Amino acid sequence: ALDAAYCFRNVQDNCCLRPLYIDFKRDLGWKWIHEPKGYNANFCAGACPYLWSSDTQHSRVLSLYNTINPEASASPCCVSQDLEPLTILYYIGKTPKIEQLSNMIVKSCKCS
Amino acid sequence: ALDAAYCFRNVQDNCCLRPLYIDFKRDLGWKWIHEPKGYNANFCAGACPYLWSSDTQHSRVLSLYNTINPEASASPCCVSQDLEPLTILYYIGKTPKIEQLSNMIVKSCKCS
């Protein structure tokens, strides 16, 4: 899979999972989230050559088209595949609010 | 939607559907497909600013992160949303083969 095991601690140009830890206050200026203070959002980035983790038939065809005609700028894109949720705690005055946000953390990537 | 109505015949920088007709033989060198001779594959391309057709919570958060820190190269990507199939006819010797390929044509885009 295009996951941490394959992707982290390898520097490759093709589509792969890239690590990214976001500190809510420091990076986004969100001072209102109480816990957690940050999380491993991660992201997907890299080239999508022919048949490299192709999502659909369209990704397969476009990955071949883009190899032949790169000027078209029609390459498939390296995007999230598997994601995980994140539970946050924030206050609303003194009313503690707990919310489970789905699809917050990316665990694997694909060429779509 | 980020579809033909909004996107074609407008030249915008943000994520949008882009037209692309592929001629099998001329563009891909696939001489073995009998009908159709080509089709409207189309593609998705363009910038993903904060909240522009955000797919998941991760796309929402990363679109804000990328606005503040563009060097990170962590932007969400403009990718297919709705797709359509395409039926092709090809021969295998003199055995006509008919296949319906799913997700061949892109009709709308999203920032994922």
- Residue A74 belongs to what domain range? 1-112
What is the number of H-type helices and E-type strands within chain A? 2, 9
From B23, B83, B81, select the one nearest B52 (Cα to Cα).
B81
Tally the C-alpha atoms within 13 A of residue B88's C-alpha that lie toward its C-beta. 20
Count of domains for chain B: 1
Q: For residues B69 and A56, what is the distance between their CA atoms, to the nearest angstrom?
A: 31
Q: For residues B78 and A108, what is the distance between their CA atoms, to the nearest angstrom?
A: 18
CB B107 within 8 A of CB A60: no
User: Any idea what the CATH number is for the domain that residue B52 is in?
Assistant: 2.10.90.10
Structure tokens at B72: 């990170």
| Structural element, H or E, at residue B66 | helix B57-68
Structure tokens at B70: 């563009």
Q: Is B92 exposed, middle or buried (0-12, 13-18, 19+ CB in 10 A)?
A: exposed
Q: H helices of chain A, where?
A: 4-7, 57-68
Q: For residues B63 and B54, what is the distance between their CA atoms, to the nearest angstrom?
A: 8
CB B38 within 8 A of CB B21: yes
CB A46 within 8 A of CB A53: no
Q: For residues A106 and B51, what is the distance between their CA atoms, to the nearest angstrom?
A: 18
The C-alpha angle B54, B55, B61, rounded to 5 degrees, equals: 60
- Contact residues, chain B to chain A, C-beta under 8 Å: 18, 20, 22, 27-28, 41, 43-45, 56-58, 61-62, 64-65, 68-69, 72-74, 76-80, 83, 101-106, 112
| Structural element, H or E, at residue A79 | strand A78-80
| Structural element, H or E, at residue A43 | strand A43-45
CB A17 within 8 A of CB A109: yes
From B20, B19, B25, select the one nearest B6 (Cα to Cα).
B19
